[PDB]
């Protein structure tokens, strides 16, 4: 049984160009790609992505850091939304685990490189509001037998 | 001291085509290759090898999944069989630390890529099951004196 | 707001020929290179170094096994000191988190490839004993806007 996460390559990690590395950490688990697109996030749409952070001070802050080109991305795999987050590490770089995305690229929260959807409901949302279905391509892995049990 | 433990590559692990990187993982600690071959695990063997989970629900599969190629392996070091337990990671990959083998690579128990001795009596049982003792080479790394107290 | 801190690859990371490795960690978060010399460490400037260990057993040892090649850095970034010691790990490589430089490379406390400064006291008194204030580069990373808040 596999789920699928939406995880977004911010703009820092666009332009410090370390977005076929941040791929590869997930090819290399056997997560499948169902989706992938560049485009150039917005402040209407980084508001809805932002919803539940709506009124805050820090809000504004991040908008504009988070306007700028932006990978899109839709990865399948066993427990891949919770096993995602686990790779990024925490929010803080400082704080995440040794081995992290967050922890080997990154120093601060406000340029952490990656976002990814923190539960089914939220994947759920952000896949509809970033993609629309037919970008969301089905076809199975040719390793699979490898990789699942 | 330093003494020898048992590491086998699984089928996944051949199929996947990552036999080079995880060699690398022990390579760049400093342990040395003691042996090394390339086989076909059948059952008779791999009852033998896993004689400890007699009767337990997932050995005919594991059985299974294991008959296939495998690299069987001898790395030497300091304390290499538990610090080899430890770079693997735990058994589910969905538990196992950032940074292990099992994590960086793998999704599920059943496809978690690679066998190692979990003691040291263990490691002397499965090395004289895999190897027979003329396999086992003697050398000294030249890098020794920078490796070791 | 950024600090400092003093990071010297060790006599046994020159001779592995890893450098290149250790350097590459550091650059990968965004951390600034601000100064950085090759030398032969002695005895009198070790001593200095590691006055902290007088009287202790393992110093005469120690300072014989770092009586060589040594490459002296300067990494300047957000909570370096701190970060800088996280990403070298425990002084014992065996207990030493996956993902670590310890960890990843090496087997014992005494050829454990790296020191890193413990805290600012110790990085300002480190960074002047093995650089005269000239030998150190202030310059901006090109990469600011993506890197810091
Ligand atoms: N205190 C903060 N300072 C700067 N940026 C922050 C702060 N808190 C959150 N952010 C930014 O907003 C993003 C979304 O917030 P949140 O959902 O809490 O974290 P995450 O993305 O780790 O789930 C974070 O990834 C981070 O870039
Ligand atoms: N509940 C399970 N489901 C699927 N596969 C399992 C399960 N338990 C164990 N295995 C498989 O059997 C192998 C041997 O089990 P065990 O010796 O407990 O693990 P390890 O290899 O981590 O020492 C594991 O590496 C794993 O491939
Ligand atoms: N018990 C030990 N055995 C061998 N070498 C040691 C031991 N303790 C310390 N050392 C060596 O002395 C260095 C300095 O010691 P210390 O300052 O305590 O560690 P660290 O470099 O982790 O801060 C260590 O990096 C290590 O090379
Ligand atoms: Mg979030
Ligand atoms: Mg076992
Ligand atoms: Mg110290």
Redesign the interface.
């Known amino acids: 049984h596999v789920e699928q996460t939406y995880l977004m390559i911010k703009?820092?990690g666009i332009?410090?160009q370390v977005v076929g590395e941040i791929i590869s950490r997930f090819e290399?688990?056997?997560?499948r790609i169902a989706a992938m697109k560049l485009t150039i996030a917005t402040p209407a749409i980084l508001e809805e992505h932002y919803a539940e952070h709506k009124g805050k001070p820090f809000l504004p802050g991040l908008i504009e850091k988070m306007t700028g080109p932006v990978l899109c991305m839709v990865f399948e795999?066993?427990?891949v939304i919770?096993?995602a987050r686990?790779?990024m590490?925490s929010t803080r770089?400082?704080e995440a685990?040794?081995?992290?995305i967050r922890?080997?690229?990154?120093?601060?929260?406000?340029?952490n490189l990656i976002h990814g959807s923190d539960s089914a409901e939220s994947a759920k949302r952000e896949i509809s509001l970033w993609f629309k279905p037919e970008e969301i391509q089905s076809y199975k892995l040719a390793?699979s037998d490898?990789?699942?049990?």
């Open positions: 703009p820092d332009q410090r290399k688990r056997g997560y795999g066993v427990d919770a096993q686990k790779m590490g770089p400082g685990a040794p081995g992290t922890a080997d690229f990154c120093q601060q929260a406000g340029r390793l490898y990789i699942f049990e």
